[PDB]
Amino acid sequence: IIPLLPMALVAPDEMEKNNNPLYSRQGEVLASRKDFRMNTCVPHPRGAFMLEPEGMSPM
Amino acid sequence: QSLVQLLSKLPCGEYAMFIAWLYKYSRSSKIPHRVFTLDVVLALLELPEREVDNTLSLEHQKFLKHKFLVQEIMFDRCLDKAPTVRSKALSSFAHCLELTVTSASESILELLINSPTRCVMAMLRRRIRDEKTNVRKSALQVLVSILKHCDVSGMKEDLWILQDQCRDPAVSVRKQALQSLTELLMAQPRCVQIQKAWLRGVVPVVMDCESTVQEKALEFLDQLLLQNIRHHSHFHSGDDSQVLAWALLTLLTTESQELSRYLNKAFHIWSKKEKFSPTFINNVISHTGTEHSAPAWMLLSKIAGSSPRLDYSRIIQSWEKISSQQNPNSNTLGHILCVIGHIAKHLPKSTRDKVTDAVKCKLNGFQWSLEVISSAVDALQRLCRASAETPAEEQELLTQVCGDVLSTCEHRLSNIVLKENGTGNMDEDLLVKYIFTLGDIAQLCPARVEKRIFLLIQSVLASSASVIRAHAIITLGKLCLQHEDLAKKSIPALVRELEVCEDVAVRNNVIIVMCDLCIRYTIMVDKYIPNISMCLKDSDPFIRKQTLILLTNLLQEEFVKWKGSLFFRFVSTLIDSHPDIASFGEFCLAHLLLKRNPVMFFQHFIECIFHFNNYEKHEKYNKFPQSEREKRLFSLKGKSNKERRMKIYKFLLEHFTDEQRFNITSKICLSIL
Lengths: 59, 673
Hints:
Largest sheet of chain A: 2 strands, antiparallel
Subunit structure (chain A): Component of the condensin-2 complex, which contains the SMC2 and SMC4 heterodimer, and three non SMC subunits, NCAPG2, NCAPH2 and NCAPD3 that probably regulate the complex.
Strand content of chain B: under 5%
Radius of gyration of chain A: 15 Å
Subcellular location (chain A): Nucleus; Chromosome
Helix content of chain B: 55-70%
Radius of gyration of chain B: 34 Å
Helix content of chain A: 10-25%
Structural class of chain A: alpha+beta
Number of helices of chain A: 1
Oligomer: part of a larger assembly
Largest sheet of chain B: none
Organism (chain A): Homo sapiens (Human)
Protein name (chain A): Condensin-2 complex subunit H2
Number of strands of chain B: 0
Family (chain A): Belongs to the CND2 H2 (condensin-2 subunit 2) family.
Distance between the termini of chain B: 73 Å
Structural class of chain B: mainly alpha
Number of strands of chain A: 4
Order of helices and strands of chain A: HEEEE
Strand order of the largest sheet of chain A: 1-2
């Protein structure tokens, strides 16, 4: 019944987000690097980016 | 016991006629009598085969054979019409088949399971669909009792079916199937595909809502992997617990890597529990000399980050050796960089200076893939964090370190892109990794980006009218995440490029970028949400499933206040031709949206009915705007469309509860009618 869960549906650990914070032009820390999903983008030989390399590749 | 003793007293003929009467008595319709007779048939099968009496008749001689007995009785007993009777029949079947295993009558097993063309795989496929859980428990027990003596070659699909019963959502089913697979992998240690299907089975166990079977999986994997490998001097090929664990992590390399997230959650539990040990650190340091250390290094990716207290000089020497080497495995070098970043709080500056110098010279080398570039730039953020103890100090140090490679790659892009470019006069990979390096630098120095860089990458965008262009839009998005003025300047051009350009991959990247700008700037891109809603109707199904993943990430935090058009899109995406993406949609709403709030479909039902009816003149509702493009995309009406209407309607009915069904029947019989 229950299928596989997509991995992107899980929030990351807080200490990891403390370990990579992102700051501003003024230098104050605004967010973390793991708060955004282009870090989790995966390259393709055609140049595409997908969150899940596991699965059907586009033709 | 009394029958067995009296049967030993009985001669073969009296036994024969009494088996004839008992076989006739098996057809009696009394349920406890049938239960008692099948139990005493099992008791007779506990005894070996009765001595062959040639004086007896052919009908009496055939009673002697245990194969004929299990062919006559329990073939009908497993195929009865009562659930408890079939449950006890399958329990007696598992007992009699392990009895034939102990009596080494494998020909009986082959005659039942693989009769030369009644198929036991077929009836097992029936048993796993049974409502009763213990029927499936007896079924899994009897199918794991078999094939422990025979190879899996030719019937690995039965094992594939076995992790399909690991999928069954019952506490006892996983609670016994996990023990079954753990005794399978130690029944025979040497079969790679059994371990592959095993690890595929066991890594989604620990995401269950139930906690105890999750933990039983956690310490079963602890005794399989954590409590197997010893010190490398102590390590021996004869110590096959170590060899099995080494082979299991050898199957963890390039086969399934999403499970590392489950491992991060498991180690997060063991970080709450502090189950990591300095003895584990000593063991993995002892195995750093081994060539098997690369999965041990990616195990150390977060394990070593808890408390760096030791000497890591040999790790630095090995990293220097593989960095002087030019073509390593990218995963190995990336995991070595992340463990170096995690232990940098304990490491001194006396090594950090030459580490950063080696990074700077090899960054001038540009000898990596882009994933290694991303791991390296976050690791160098870690090195600047460990170098400094003041926000101004890390600001200045990260500023100058990023400024060096910023000016370097800036000079390279001025020499290439700002100068004339031929069709084939450049290498695409070098320029793409150069732009990616500049994007990572501008991520790490937001204060050091100027308007000349803005017009440079705008001129790069002007070279549109492909592979480089989408990555340029990605880096533009990384920059306008920090620059709201460039974001406001860009978004009409981005929206125009969304509904003009024709390549699927660049539009995928544009949607990913502007939805992460939705996560940053929801208050401003709420007006651009209907661009996502119309882009939901893509020709390519991968685009549609990717936007499903994005809208799932938008809905799980609940960024936006809920509007009926969004719910209309959530309903409308469910008529995908590919069933897996749609079923991901219903699974997402069932496990998340139903959990978060149960009443959304209750108010949304009537306007969903009006939306699929093309009715806009409602007094209470239907106040939302509409576009011509979505009007022609929404072919949702007519005789050609009625089937998906009441399909969706009955899906919503089974989503509704009985109290909700009663209240919604009251609402439809009052308000609409």
